[PDB]
């Protein structure tokens, strides 16, 4: 077990039922790879710096998990497979190094 | 026969030639011009004066389409790039904003020996 | 990687007396743990040469500590060897 952050950027053109279906798939995938969800921030609609699949905006989903490390890559594979999932970034957690004290 | 109102101009300037394309707000070309489009043939094409004459030529050609406003976009660093922008300002086309779009890579391709 | 708990189990298994972190026995046990993990890592990843040098050096240390022990108290050396399954 190690602590990670799961970043997911999906289709801003999504409606309720379908968006919550992609979220159903995300939950089921995370939980299927052994990942326990510590907390979740949902920012949603945000203006990207550059277009992604022709889209100016993106819908952001941030998770923090604890999962078997041997399974992380395959987890992200499973997350990516979805047509509607535009971007995925998994990151090892880090203690928040500060500055300008 | 368009009557394109406002639109935009691309100045692509190399050391060898200067060439100016004018387009609609969607980027589609209306008219273009260059050093060789006017009388110039050899090295003379990439002179700044030629750049002036090219800017102008393209601008008049554009005002035939009934152009008023234009957004200038500059690519390349070459002799008389800025003379193109200069002639283009006084061209009677009202120049709305200038910008530099000159491409550079993130180090993709090996250049020619000339360029190392 | 080798976590704290694993390492500690190896130490409390190989210590001469409670609290012995650094005796030749404990050292050789630990060396052996790392050696096995690495030699395992190199079964796949045959192309990682730098790591391999690491392993050469580990083996060198182990051989030297064993050479020392055998020179010193041959019985403890037999014991160590059989326990670990070396030589």
């Amino acid at each position: 077990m190690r602590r990670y952050e799961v970043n997911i950027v999906l289709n801003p053109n999504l409606d309720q039922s379908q968006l919550a279906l992609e979220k159903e798939i995300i939950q089921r995938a995370l939980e299927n790879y052994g990942a326990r969800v510590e907390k979740v921030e949902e920012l949603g609609l945000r203006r990207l710096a550059y277009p992604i699949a022709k889209d100016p905006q993106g819908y952001f989903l941030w998770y923090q998990v604890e999962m078997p490390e041997d399974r992380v890559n395959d987890l992200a594979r499973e997350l990516r497979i979805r047509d509607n999932v535009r971007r995925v970034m998994v990151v090892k957690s880090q203690e928040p190094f500060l500055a300008n004290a | 026969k368009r009557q394109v109102a406002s639109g935009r101009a691309y100045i692509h300037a190399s050391y060898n030639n200067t060439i100016v394309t004018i387009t609609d707000p969607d980027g589609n070309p209306i008219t273009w011009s260059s050093g060789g489009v006017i009388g110039y043939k050899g090295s003379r094409k990439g002179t700044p004066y030629a750049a002036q004459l090219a800017a102008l030529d393209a601008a008049k050609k554009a005002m035939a389409y009934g152009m008023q406003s234009v957004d200038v976009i500059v690519r390349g660093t070459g002799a008389g790039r800025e003379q193109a922008i200069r002639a283009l300002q006084a061209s009677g086309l009202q120049v709305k904003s200038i910008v530099d779009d000159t491409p550079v890579p993130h180090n993709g391709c090996r250049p020619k020996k000339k360029f190392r | 990687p080798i976590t704290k708990e694993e390492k500690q189990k190896v130490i409390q298994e190989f210590a001469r007396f409670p609290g012995d972190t650094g005796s030749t026995e404990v050292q050789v046990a630990l060396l052996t743990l790392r050696i096995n993990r690495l030699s395992e890592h190199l079964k796949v990843h045959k192309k990682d040469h730098h790591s391999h040098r690491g392993l050469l050096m580990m083996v060198g240390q182990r051989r030297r500590l064993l050479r020392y022990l055998q020179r010193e108290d041959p019985e403890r050396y037999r014991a160590l060897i059989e326990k670990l399954g070396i030589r």
Binding site: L48, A49, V91, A99 | I85, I98, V99, D100 | -
Partner: protein
């Protein structure tokens, strides 16, 4: 022409999701600023870099920008 860290509060340098603060360390173009301009230290700048690059891949920060005026 003050340095970027000079105007700010305590902020997590490792946080790639905070755009508002990270945008401060970019150029007019998407270029990550020199130390002399960001006023950070070696280690600081070194972490900032990776954080920014992260934010870019995520889509919240530019790789490149058009230069106005000129």
């Amino acid at each position: 022409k003050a340095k970027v860290k000079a105007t700010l509060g305590e902020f997590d340098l490792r946080d790639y999701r905070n755009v508002e603060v990270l945008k401060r360390f970019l150029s007019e173009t998407g270029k990550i600023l020199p130390r002399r301009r960001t006023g950070l230290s070696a280690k600081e700048q070194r972490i900032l870099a990776k954080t920014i690059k992260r934010a870019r891949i995520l889509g919240l920060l530019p790789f490149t920008e058009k230069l106005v005026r000129k």
